Amino acid sequence: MDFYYLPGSAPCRAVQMTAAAVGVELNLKLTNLMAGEHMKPEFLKLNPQHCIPTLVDEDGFVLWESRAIQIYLVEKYGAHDADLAERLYPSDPRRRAVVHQRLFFDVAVLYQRFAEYYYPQIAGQKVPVGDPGRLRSMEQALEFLNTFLEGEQYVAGGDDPTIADLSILATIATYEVAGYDLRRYENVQRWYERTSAIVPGADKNVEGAKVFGRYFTQ
Amino acid sequence: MDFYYLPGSAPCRAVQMTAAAVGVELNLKLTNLMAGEHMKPEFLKLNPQHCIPTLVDEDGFVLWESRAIQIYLVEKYGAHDADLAERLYPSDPRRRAVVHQRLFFDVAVLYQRFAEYYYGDPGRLRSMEQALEFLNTFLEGEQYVAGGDDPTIADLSILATIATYEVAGYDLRRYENVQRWYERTSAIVPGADKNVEGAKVFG
Ligand SMILES: CCCCCCSC[C@H](NC(=O)CC[C@H]([NH3+])C(=O)O)C(=O)NCC(=O)O
């Protein structure tokens, strides 16, 4: 299964952790966005949205959006080990719904506000300062996460990490390398250390996040 | 089941079409954001993220994010009509993955870039038009946004978003597949008339 990616990319790292959890080996295909490798006609024919991660499965089925890939990996490549799939992606509609809400929270709030705050600083114009409104908004996202984690081990509840933990762990590791002091959010920091110590593929998350630190050397 | 909403709100409209599709009646709880009703302690106790739509089911289960609500409605209520549930939310992992990708596309790209442009910047406009072009491309040779022979919850979500584009004054006929899908899907999806009317009257 071909996996078009960059290690620095949070959503790519979420997929790497999930593939590790379900015992899927990914054929890693570095996709240099700066070089426009995602804009090559062969890539566009696979994925007209020209984005990473992109997964191409054994039949040539092409999928993108990291969290859609996470669910697909569990349902198709994990579900044989029923207990494992249930831990990663509980099927009770209430439990499933909380996992989904946290995944959407990660894409549209937690990672979205990270991008809105930092991307203008580290790319394009490279604005020399962060917008204070964008900072407050981002801090509000961290505050939401901190609240979700109050009296809970994991982001969507459960006795074990779910795919929501894996997605948010990719995101939070990116906050860390950006230089955000997560110790401001005690539950987030506690969860971050614990989940980093136990999840499959945490090595890919840690090393890839360090790579993304290349945007933050100044 | 209690539905905390505003009539003009896209994600609210998406949930309303989905409830209609599964034959669920919603107890409407108008939640005025400009009036700060989402920041009242009663609401914050239900939903610390203080956002609408929020659903409270009979058993006291609280849920937010429209697209999570959509899935919940199908899984819990749609499942009483097996063929219906499979039309709205196909179970095959590949088919479901496309539905999921389209739902995430809607929140993070299509609606996101709409919000960035309308809530006029040349760069923000370009980014928004790129999202419309993506949807236009997805719809080349497909009746529905995630494929399939019938509308899925991804169609319903994107219908709510696209109705907001229309009322904001964007010329959707620039994206032929988008306009074609929008007019046709609006004609056949139960409650989709109310979607456009709600967008037009309150958006
Ligand atoms: C500013 C520093 C660099 C940040 C890199 C961000 S990750 C690369 C980016 N991918 C995404 O943002 C995918 C997000 C998507 N929501 C997911 O989870 O898969 C991309 O392919 N972008 C190219 C494109 O979409 O055209």
Ligand SMILES: CCCCCCSC[C@H](NC(=O)CC[C@H]([NH3+])C(=O)O)C(=O)NCC(=O)O
């Ligand atoms: C005239 C209607 C136009 C304005 C409607 C905007 S939708 C209201 C907004 N809700 C959301 O953006 C929820 C988005 C979420 N992605 C979903 O799909 O449910 C909100 O509760 N915002 C308040 C908050 O989050 O604090």
